[PDB]
Design a protein around this ligand. Structure first.
Ligand SMILES: N=C(N)c1ccc(CNC(=O)[C@@H]2CCN2C(=O)[C@H](NCC(=O)O)C2CCCCC2)cc1
Ligand SMILES: *[C@@H]1O[C@H](CO)[C@@H](O[C@@H]2O[C@H](CO)[C@@H](O)[C@H](O)[C@H]2NC(C)=O)[C@H](O)[C@H]1NC(C)=O
Ligand code: NA
Ligand code: NA
Lengths: 10, 29, 251
């Protein structure tokens, strides 16, 4: 249930 | 560092959080 | 954290969240001790009994957070791990003796109103503050109860407990590398760290120089917030020589 993080962080 | 342990939103502004006094009051010696 | 309360914004700027890449989930707490070093509990990274054995690439470090699950854009900073260092004498087989580990970040993190390092104690700091009765503060995004999950970082202030009492509350062997904290049944008040809070900091504010020092690391317990039981923490000063060695050698 964690919001997705920017893809830049692999 | 020489600035370690000093919080920007509290110690740096001379503001205290709601429960740090509870800690101080427990340090009797 | 059980029986604690919502933390104030910027209350624990050194609080770090160890985040597992896949599946995306909370792995543990941790703390920022410099712009490139993060301190945590060894069992957060290595624990054979539960088939836990993470490598650098398996996780991320999220600093400056408040909300547990949300991506706090423009506030939190996410860092990758360059290298993990677990205490060579960490005892995962018996009592989690020397439950401590360091993680070097690939790039230094920039400090802000929400990101700032905590101090590590020296011998005099430890001697003066590590006394039964003296209260420390534990923070984390772990379980709200033993048997659920908080919206934001939780905080609880707990008194350090006399060693004989810590010893008499468990069948587990206690070492000088750990101390326990928490209220007694008669003291009325409650509070404890819990699953998910591991690796997080137990801090105390020096009344001498008014700086926050990390005296302990959430390590273990038997259940959470149970009457007659106490939370156990890694004694940071006792293991500072190792910390200094690792940082001096690789940083
Ligand atoms: N202060 C607390 N109440 C508390 C804080 C953090 C934690 C999470 N840490 C862990 O799960 C670590 C690795 C194994 N373990 C434990 O705590 C084990 N109990 C497992 C358990 O009681 O759930 C204990 C059991 C007795 C021997 C040492 C290991 C658990 C309790
Ligand atoms: C934990 O995982 C690491 C992988 O990061 C394992 O490390 C290996 O250890 C063996 C020795 O038993 C070496 O021969 C390998 O070269 C190491 N790397 C790998 C990729 O296997 C380690 O064995 C695992 N268990 C423990 C207790 O650390
Ligand atoms: Na005992
Ligand atoms: Na208890």
């Amino acid at each position: 249930d964690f919001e997705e993080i920017p893809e830049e962080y692999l | 560092e020489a600035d370690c342990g000093l919080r920007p939103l509290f110690e740096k502004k001379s503001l205290e959080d709601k429960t740090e006094r509870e800690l101080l009051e427990s340090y009797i010696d | 954290i059980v029986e604690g309360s919502d933390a104030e914004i910027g209350m624990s700027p050194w609080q770090v969240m160890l985040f597992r890449k896949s599946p995306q989930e909370l792995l543990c707490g941790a703390s920022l001790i410099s712009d490139r070093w993060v301190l945590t509990a060894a069992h957060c990274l290595l624990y054979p009994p539960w088939d836990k054995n993470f490598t650098e690439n398996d996780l991320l470090v999220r600093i400056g957070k408040h909300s547990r699950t949300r991506y706090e854009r423009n506030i939190e900073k996410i860092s990758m791990l360059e290298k993990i260092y677990i205490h060579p004498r960490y005892n995962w087989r018996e009592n989690l003796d020397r439950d401590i580990a360091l993680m070097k970040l690939k790039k230094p993190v920039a400090f802000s109103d929400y990101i700032h390092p905590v101090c590590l104690p020296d011998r005099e700091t430890a001697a003066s503050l590590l006394q039964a009765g003296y209260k420390g503060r534990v923070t984390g995004w772990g379980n709200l109860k033993e048997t659920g999950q908080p919206s934001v970082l939780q905080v609880v202030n707990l008194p350090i407990v006399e060693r004989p009492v810590c010893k008499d509350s468990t069948r587990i062997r206690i070492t000088d590398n750990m101390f326990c904290a928490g209220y007694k049944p008669d003291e009325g008040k409650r509070g404890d760290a819990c699953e998910g809070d591991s690796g997080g900091p137990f801090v105390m504010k020096s009344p001498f120089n008014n700086r926050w020092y990390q005296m302990g690391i959430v390590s273990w317990g038997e259940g959470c917030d149970r009457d007659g039981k106490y939370g156990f923490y890694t004694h940071v000063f006792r293991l500072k020589k190792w910390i200094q060695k690792v940082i001096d050698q690789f940083g």
